[PDB]
Every structure is written in C-alpha cells, then in structure tokens.
Amino acid sequence: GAISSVLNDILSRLDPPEAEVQIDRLITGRLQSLQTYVTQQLIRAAEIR
C-alpha cells in the first residue's frame, strides 16, 4: 500500500510527517512477512525433529 517500497525514496520525497504514514505501511507488512517465515520454520522444525 505504500507509494514506493524503497525507504530512501519515502524519506527523500515526503515531509517528515507525511513520510511516517508511508513507512508505517511498509513496516506493518514486513512484520507479517517475518511472522509467516517463523511460523513455517516452527512447523518444519517439528517435522525434522
């Protein structure tokens, strides 16, 4: 949902108050991406053991 996936672009374009909105969108999704990875690794961890 962010204007651009590059953080440097958001900081080099939008003002400080406007950049926080775009950066929050990227962080929120990247959190879900890590949660998906760890979730799968824990499942596979039970299989390999």
């Binding site: 440097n8 672009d9 900081l11 080099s12």
Partner: protein, 48 residues
C-alpha cells in the same frame, strides 16, 4: 572506491561499497537489479 560510502547518483540514495564492475550495460541501460530487485550496479552520469 573500495570503501563503504553513502552515494547519491541521479537521485538514487543508498549506502554500499563502490567497486569497478566487469558487467557491460548496453548504451540505453542505466541501473541494474539483482534477484532481490535491489540495485546491482549504478552508473556515474558525469564520467560513464
């Protein structure tokens, strides 16, 4: 070169070690990207 530096080229901001690359870009090509879509290499606009 051969040092980690903050480079800004044609408005592209980033931090990385600058080194000479053997990859040949066609005259029209500008910036390359790796498997991760991150910049693989850049081009100095003044001295090509």
């Amino acid at each position: 070169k051969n040092k980690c530096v903050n480079f800004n080229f044609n408005g592209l901001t980033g931090t990385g070690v600058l080194t000479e690359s053997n990859k040949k870009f066609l005259p029209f090509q500008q910036f390359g990207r790796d498997i991760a879509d991150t910049t693989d290499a850049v081009r100095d606009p003044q001295t090509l």
